[PDB]
């Protein structure tokens, strides 16, 4: 089953993208539930809705918010994805991941991946920010992987490693910075595990997920990271912790992400600022030092 | 990948169903290996084979037993599914689950799901009845989920919860009743884990299944329960324990479910009676108390 | 979803195979990364490239090495598969497994399955040979199983067991023989777990894989074994251990299988010799004793 997308298809989409924007971004950022809020911060912002870009997986049903805004965020030139794509939505992983491949041909060397997890480690408060340090791809344990097909050496190897996925440096460099800004609560670090399907994890499941030694759980970020690294992109990311998964038999109270009122607002604002002062710590190709 | 079934398709099938039967059931029951034996108990029984109902996933190869019999079981009006459908049989989960959606439009508020598991908890005898208390969907950990596609708000939310799947009340109300009837052996309670594929679990696998903290294992009941709850149906179910999965290196004796002689007969008879005196404990919409 | 291959399709391919070769093999061997090296050992060797056999899944992109050579190895008549097929390559499991079914109709009663794993047990050196003793099919935990469809009683049952997969005798008979030849290092024994997708296991993943109690990991050998046993073939196999999966945060050195220089040569040579003196321990249909 090869990818319905042929190399010329990306070429095409990059080019296009590169003939409609005087902008050459060095960083792609992927925005997650209640986090497209970061696109307000850009400067020289230039917005293109998927619908409009030649082969772009167009968005489904949930709302009018999902487009590609180019701009300037603190010194570095970025591309930002508002509204990503998930497996639950019906998309083959060669669709969720398409963006990353074009970003490659734009000329992006770094990618920050945001998301809003469920925490599973008993020391996490809704509000927390977790530096993804690692992942657990269950979907991939079974062949649900974006690199599943004939390989495209123009993209990468056949068997890329992942010990290594989320940069040690941008991870040290992130840790330091939370010093810098001198924040209240701590900037967690843990493993991120993915789970596909839309319904939520029951309680035996929350317990497997936790015995597997995961700290947050969600329905995104691993496909995109894998094919990001396949391509040699520098990857680092964070998780906004919204829920706090029940590992005991009880009457859940909970019902939202950010919908309620400050749930995503409050905690989402701090990561948006964090991500924004981090642009500064990301090496600049012109390594003219 | 949306569901090959469009809302009008259910509408159609319900209607039909509702213009061929003077019966309006308030309970659907799903019968599992060696348990269609319950349809003998109905009264005012009205039988319709799948083949005959407009979009109904028609049955495969194993035998002539698989149809939909409406009737009367102890006071409540039920619909009973003799011979369910599995993933191993080749069916997308939007096929295994179709029935549940029509039951929805029939006007069913409750669903009991029977099945015959393998026990994995070292205190279970073949014969036992386990109240499923919870589940572990491995198939779904990877995107094999029935809610995988664009959502149908007429059916439900996008991200339904499952902490909650198997009613606390019908579960207390079941526990009590085994008192009532005053039975010999005890009515177990545990977690039910699903596994797709037809071949049986080897011995390292039986051990993962058990470390994951499951108590019974099978190849059904989770899809149907998930989309049952998606729809706000009251769900409760049981497992008949037929085998007793080997977690040590040895020469299995075993070879059947019920095929042998009383294997499914004996133990299947008690659950059929149990299910039958439970109709009485299920609330009656006319809540005229 | 039935198998795109209909019984007449195998018939056809066997026949063909059986009208182009005066050879009737009693053993199929499946060769794995850096192990087609065994075909040099045959005698009366007769080579047929996939491309050429009527329905044979033809090979992809990686190189010119992948064909079916019949011959004579120590007394027994074998068929040897140079270059197997994987899920990562894009193949439905009814494609990876096709070969096994024809071997069935050739008249093969035994199958040895080679492969080159990653070791996960902390006592294994790259170089080691592990007698697969058992398996963990994650792909199958989710419905990615070769027996997924309508059953073909001419092939087998519906629900075949696997406690039993890798022969106790050929396993004792193998153990003894490493005595016989009197080898330096020991002939390991452990559980083999499969994982699909091409990229490599990160470090939380290596830890799940190991908590699941696996000892080696790879991207082959379980489909083929399952449908081999479905068919009542005697199965036994080995793993060549090439890597030594990182279960700690560190800077991997590693980069190859056999590519480097003696990595696959050295260790691959010993298994090829081992497999070769084992032909002698495999019962001979003419049981004229």
Short mmCIF file of N, CA and C in Angstrom, two decimals, chain B residues 175-238:
data_model
loop_
_atom_site.label_atom_id
_atom_site.label_comp_id
_atom_site.label_asym_id
_atom_site.label_seq_id
_atom_site.Cartn_x
_atom_site.Cartn_y
_atom_site.Cartn_z
N UNK B 175 -25.71 -8.10 40.95
CA UNK B 175 -25.09 -8.76 42.13
C UNK B 175 -26.18 -9.22 43.10
N UNK B 176 -27.02 -8.27 43.61
CA UNK B 176 -28.16 -8.61 44.47
C UNK B 176 -28.84 -9.87 43.92
N UNK B 177 -29.51 -9.87 42.82
CA UNK B 177 -30.22 -10.97 42.22
C UNK B 177 -29.56 -12.32 42.31
N UNK B 178 -28.24 -12.40 42.18
CA UNK B 178 -27.59 -13.76 42.31
C UNK B 178 -27.82 -14.15 43.78
N UNK B 179 -28.07 -13.15 44.63
CA UNK B 179 -28.42 -13.43 46.04
C UNK B 179 -29.82 -14.13 45.96
N UNK B 180 -30.78 -13.38 45.55
CA UNK B 180 -32.17 -13.66 45.33
C UNK B 180 -32.38 -15.11 44.95
N UNK B 181 -31.90 -15.45 43.79
CA UNK B 181 -32.01 -16.82 43.24
C UNK B 181 -31.21 -17.75 44.16
N UNK B 182 -30.35 -17.22 45.01
CA UNK B 182 -29.48 -18.01 45.88
C UNK B 182 -28.64 -19.11 45.26
N UNK B 183 -27.84 -18.82 44.25
CA UNK B 183 -26.98 -19.76 43.52
C UNK B 183 -25.77 -20.34 44.24
N UNK B 184 -25.37 -21.50 43.72
CA UNK B 184 -24.25 -22.29 44.27
C UNK B 184 -22.98 -21.44 44.22
N UNK B 185 -22.32 -21.53 43.09
CA UNK B 185 -21.04 -20.85 42.85
C UNK B 185 -21.32 -19.37 42.68
N UNK B 186 -20.31 -18.59 42.83
CA UNK B 186 -20.30 -17.13 42.77
C UNK B 186 -20.25 -16.61 41.34
N UNK B 187 -20.80 -15.45 41.14
CA UNK B 187 -20.93 -14.60 39.98
C UNK B 187 -19.75 -13.61 39.91
N UNK B 188 -18.70 -14.00 39.26
CA UNK B 188 -17.45 -13.28 39.14
C UNK B 188 -17.70 -11.88 38.62
N UNK B 189 -16.69 -11.09 38.74
CA UNK B 189 -16.62 -9.72 38.23
C UNK B 189 -15.15 -9.44 37.86
N UNK B 190 -14.95 -8.88 36.69
CA UNK B 190 -13.60 -8.58 36.23
C UNK B 190 -13.67 -7.65 35.01
N UNK B 191 -12.45 -7.48 34.46
CA UNK B 191 -12.23 -6.64 33.27
C UNK B 191 -12.27 -7.53 32.05
N UNK B 192 -12.82 -7.20 30.94
CA UNK B 192 -12.87 -7.94 29.70
C UNK B 192 -11.92 -7.29 28.67
N UNK B 193 -10.91 -7.92 28.17
CA UNK B 193 -10.05 -7.37 27.14
C UNK B 193 -10.34 -7.92 25.75
N UNK B 194 -10.43 -7.16 24.70
CA UNK B 194 -10.62 -7.72 23.34
C UNK B 194 -9.27 -7.83 22.62
N UNK B 195 -9.18 -8.73 21.69
CA UNK B 195 -8.14 -9.22 20.79
C UNK B 195 -8.91 -9.62 19.53
N UNK B 196 -8.56 -9.17 18.34
CA UNK B 196 -9.20 -9.41 17.09
C UNK B 196 -9.21 -10.82 16.56
N UNK B 197 -8.33 -11.16 15.69
CA UNK B 197 -7.82 -12.20 14.79
C UNK B 197 -8.37 -13.49 15.35
N UNK B 198 -8.57 -14.42 14.49
CA UNK B 198 -9.12 -15.70 14.88
C UNK B 198 -8.29 -16.67 15.65
N UNK B 199 -7.03 -16.86 15.44
CA UNK B 199 -6.16 -17.90 16.08
C UNK B 199 -6.16 -17.62 17.53
N UNK B 200 -5.73 -18.51 18.39
CA UNK B 200 -5.75 -18.30 19.85
C UNK B 200 -4.45 -17.77 20.38
N UNK B 201 -4.57 -17.14 21.51
CA UNK B 201 -3.48 -16.42 22.25
C UNK B 201 -2.44 -17.42 22.60
N UNK B 202 -1.18 -17.25 22.35
CA UNK B 202 -0.13 -18.23 22.70
C UNK B 202 0.08 -18.07 24.18
N UNK B 203 1.18 -18.29 24.82
CA UNK B 203 1.47 -18.24 26.28
C UNK B 203 2.19 -16.99 26.71
N UNK B 204 3.04 -16.40 25.88
CA UNK B 204 3.68 -15.09 26.28
C UNK B 204 2.44 -14.21 26.17
N UNK B 205 1.73 -14.04 25.15
CA UNK B 205 0.47 -13.30 24.97
C UNK B 205 -0.50 -13.50 26.12
N UNK B 206 -0.86 -14.71 26.51
CA UNK B 206 -1.72 -14.86 27.66
C UNK B 206 -1.03 -14.07 28.75
N UNK B 207 0.30 -14.24 28.93
CA UNK B 207 0.88 -13.39 30.01
C UNK B 207 0.82 -11.91 29.76
N UNK B 208 0.57 -11.39 28.56
CA UNK B 208 0.69 -9.86 28.50
C UNK B 208 -0.69 -9.48 28.98
N UNK B 209 -1.63 -10.07 28.27
CA UNK B 209 -3.08 -9.97 28.56
C UNK B 209 -3.28 -9.97 30.05
N UNK B 210 -2.69 -10.84 30.78
CA UNK B 210 -2.88 -10.89 32.27
C UNK B 210 -2.11 -9.80 32.95
N UNK B 211 -0.84 -9.49 32.56
CA UNK B 211 -0.15 -8.36 33.24
C UNK B 211 -1.04 -7.14 32.97
N UNK B 212 -1.58 -6.92 31.81
CA UNK B 212 -2.44 -5.71 31.51
C UNK B 212 -3.60 -5.61 32.49
N UNK B 213 -3.67 -6.68 33.30
CA UNK B 213 -4.70 -6.83 34.32
C UNK B 213 -6.08 -7.15 33.80
N UNK B 214 -6.30 -7.94 32.77
CA UNK B 214 -7.53 -8.41 32.23
C UNK B 214 -7.91 -9.71 32.99
N UNK B 215 -9.16 -10.14 32.93
CA UNK B 215 -9.59 -11.36 33.60
C UNK B 215 -10.22 -12.29 32.59
N UNK B 216 -10.76 -11.82 31.51
CA UNK B 216 -11.29 -12.69 30.42
C UNK B 216 -10.88 -12.14 29.08
N UNK B 217 -10.79 -12.94 28.01
CA UNK B 217 -10.34 -12.43 26.69
C UNK B 217 -11.23 -12.95 25.58
N UNK B 218 -11.54 -12.29 24.50
CA UNK B 218 -12.37 -12.70 23.44
C UNK B 218 -12.22 -11.89 22.19
N UNK B 219 -13.17 -12.00 21.28
CA UNK B 219 -13.06 -11.41 19.97
C UNK B 219 -14.29 -10.71 19.53
N UNK B 220 -14.95 -10.09 20.43
CA UNK B 220 -16.21 -9.37 20.37
C UNK B 220 -16.42 -8.52 21.63
N UNK B 221 -17.56 -7.93 21.62
CA UNK B 221 -18.26 -7.13 22.63
C UNK B 221 -17.78 -5.75 22.81
N UNK B 222 -16.56 -5.39 22.49
CA UNK B 222 -16.16 -3.92 22.70
C UNK B 222 -16.66 -3.06 21.63
N UNK B 223 -16.55 -3.17 20.30
CA UNK B 223 -17.09 -2.29 19.30
C UNK B 223 -18.51 -1.92 19.71
N UNK B 224 -19.46 -2.85 19.63
CA UNK B 224 -20.86 -2.76 19.97
C UNK B 224 -21.08 -2.02 21.28
N UNK B 225 -20.23 -2.22 22.28
CA UNK B 225 -20.50 -1.51 23.53
C UNK B 225 -20.18 0.00 23.33
N UNK B 226 -19.05 0.28 22.80
CA UNK B 226 -18.63 1.66 22.53
C UNK B 226 -19.61 2.50 21.79
N UNK B 227 -20.14 1.98 20.67
CA UNK B 227 -21.09 2.77 19.86
C UNK B 227 -22.46 2.64 20.51
N UNK B 228 -22.61 1.77 21.47
CA UNK B 228 -23.90 1.60 22.18
C UNK B 228 -23.89 2.83 23.09
N UNK B 229 -22.88 2.94 23.90
CA UNK B 229 -22.71 4.11 24.81
C UNK B 229 -22.63 5.41 24.08
N UNK B 230 -22.15 5.47 22.88
CA UNK B 230 -21.97 6.73 22.08
C UNK B 230 -23.35 7.36 21.96
N UNK B 231 -24.31 6.46 21.82
CA UNK B 231 -25.73 6.64 21.67
C UNK B 231 -26.46 6.73 23.01
N UNK B 232 -25.82 6.71 24.12
CA UNK B 232 -26.52 6.79 25.41
C UNK B 232 -27.40 5.60 25.63
N UNK B 233 -26.85 4.40 25.40
CA UNK B 233 -27.77 3.24 25.69
C UNK B 233 -27.23 2.80 27.05
N UNK B 234 -27.99 2.20 27.89
CA UNK B 234 -27.58 1.71 29.19
C UNK B 234 -26.93 0.39 28.87
N UNK B 235 -25.73 0.16 29.31
CA UNK B 235 -25.07 -1.12 28.89
C UNK B 235 -24.68 -1.85 30.16
N UNK B 236 -24.82 -3.15 30.03
CA UNK B 236 -24.37 -4.05 31.11
C UNK B 236 -24.17 -5.40 30.31
N UNK B 237 -23.30 -6.28 30.75
CA UNK B 237 -23.08 -7.50 30.10
C UNK B 237 -22.40 -8.51 31.00
N UNK B 238 -22.29 -9.73 30.52
CA UNK B 238 -21.65 -10.87 31.13
C UNK B 238 -20.80 -11.65 30.18
#
